[PDB]
Amino acid sequence: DLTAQVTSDLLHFPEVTIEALGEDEITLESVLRGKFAAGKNGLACLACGPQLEVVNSLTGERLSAYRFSGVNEQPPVVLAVKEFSWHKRTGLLIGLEEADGSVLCLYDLGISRVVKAVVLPGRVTAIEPIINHGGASASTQHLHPSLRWLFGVAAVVTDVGQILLIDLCLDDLSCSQNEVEASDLEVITGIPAEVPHIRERVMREGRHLCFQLVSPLGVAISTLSYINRTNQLAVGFSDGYLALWNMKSMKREYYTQLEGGRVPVHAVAFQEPENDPRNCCYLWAVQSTQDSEGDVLSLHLLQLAFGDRKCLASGQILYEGLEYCEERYTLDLAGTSNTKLLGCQSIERFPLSPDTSVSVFTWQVNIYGQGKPSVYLGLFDINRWYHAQMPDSLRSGESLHNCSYFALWSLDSVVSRTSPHHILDILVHERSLNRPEQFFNPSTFNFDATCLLDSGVIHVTCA
Structure with missing residues (x-):
């Protein structure tokens, strides 16, 4: 019965941060959301309505804050936040849901200002940086020639299934433009040639070039992730389908419904x-109804088999030539009760391949x-x-509490200690991960x- 132990007091955000977020009940009914940023700057971001607070992930100190304004005099909602560094700047890409449509912003943490913004032709559901620079360099050779002519590329997806x-x-x-002065896009359907000629005109007209992928419309995209090691954009749909798009060829390499059925990919x-x-790697996909009923939460391990590995001039390894993709493990965490995924985090250590690779899933169950x-x-x-011989599910009788390839920790000491505060996200510290066959x-x-x-924030140790 592994139980986490609390190692710090609750380290509160400053009052000004708490107060700013609690103006949740005007731009209401705003949900406070918060995530640790994925990068290497030790940030966590909280958003409620139009308010963004960036805090120090270990101390809770306020690092940066911004209240976004609406181009159409009505507050936007900060919907998506991703870490993004370029040149010698550190920033965030931000998706704002607006009454009309949406805006994608580049927010500079150095000066706490929006420095670029564009109007999106739809309602954004997720965003993902693909690359933070352009130019001819070994570092962009893995991308389709048409993308290489661009200078930094962000993928954006919408509630009708647009992939931009x-x-x-x-x-x-x-x-230098803020969210109110957002530029229009020039959207080209698919992936053209003669990009430079197009780009130059497009920017003389004060717009950003956008390639919209040829992909069916009508179903909301719910998840979006660029997988660096396979050069694939993973696109999860609200109907349980998962697409993998190769960013070299720009073609959809895979597309199937996860075994949980018509439940959003979360x-x-x-x-x-x-x-x-045989050059297999893995993509977990989580299906969850947590944003609706909260009755279904399931994990789906997809095995991706490739024909080769490629060392790029950059030194990075790339899986290439997808030969098959098939679900090889399924675990149902839910499906009265209410269950929601808090976090999903992969940790790998390299000595070629990592010698240690674990995924951490954190979830909450309310009865x-x-x-x-x-x-x-x-x-x-x-x-x-x-080592366990790739079982496709828990066996009869088998439990997460007593599974050779899964460790289960209770965070209930954290809950007791912090009630009635809500856990928004959990980050495991990679550098801390440390170890008869059992x-x-x-x-x-x-x-x-x-x-x-x-x-x-509050710190825990699991030992």
Whole structure:
């Protein structure tokens, strides 16, 4: 019965941060959302209505704050936030939902200002940087020639299924615009040739070039992730389908409904095994109804088999030539109760392939007529799953509490300690992950983590 132990007090955000977010009840009915940023700057971001607060992930200190304004005199909602660094600047890409449509912003943390913005032809559901520079360089050779003519590229997806690849025009240093002065896009359907001629005209007209992928419309995209090691954009749909798009060829390489059926794809996470005999790697896909009923939460491990590995001039390894993609593990966490995924995080250590690769899933279960939720952190070890002979599900009788390739931790001490504050996100600290065959079960892994709450941060150790 592995139980996390709390190692700090609750380190509160400053009052000014708490107060600013609590203006949630005017731009209401605004939900406070918060995530640790994926990059290497130790940031966590909280958003409520038009208000963004960037805080220090370990101390709770306020680092940056901004209240977005609406181009159409009505407050936008900060919907999506991603870390993004370019040149020698550190920033965030932000998707704003507006009454009309949407705006994609580039927010500079150095000066706490929006520096670029574009109007989106739809309602954004997710955003993802693809690359932070252009120019002819070994570092962009993995991308389709047409993207290489662009200068920074962000993917943006919408509630009707548009997939947009947008030029961030990071080569234009004369243009400093806020979210109110957002530029229009020039959207070309598919992927053209003669990009430079087009681009030059497009920018003389004060617009950003956008390639919209030829892809069916009508179903909302719910998840979006660029998988660096396979050069694939993963596009998860509200109907349970998952698309993989190769960003070299710009073609959809895979597209199938996950085994949970018509339930939205809520998150993905990539893993690479240490020793696999046919260039297989893995993509977890999480299906969840947490934004509606909250009755279904399931994990789906997709095995992606490729024909080759390629060392790029950059030094990076790339899986190339997708030969098959098939679901090889399924775990139902839910499906009265209410269950929601808090986080989904992959941690890999390299000594070629990582010698350690785990995915961490954190989820919360609320039973109706039960005040305090249970919170679980589960650690899946892909190599121990190999060692266990790749079972496709928990066996009869088998439990997460006693599984050779999965460790289950209770975060209930955190819940007791922090009530009634809500856990918004959980980050495991990669650098802390530390270790008779049973001994190499992941239950013996020690690690530290930080929970992001609505009012601060708090540190835990699992040992």
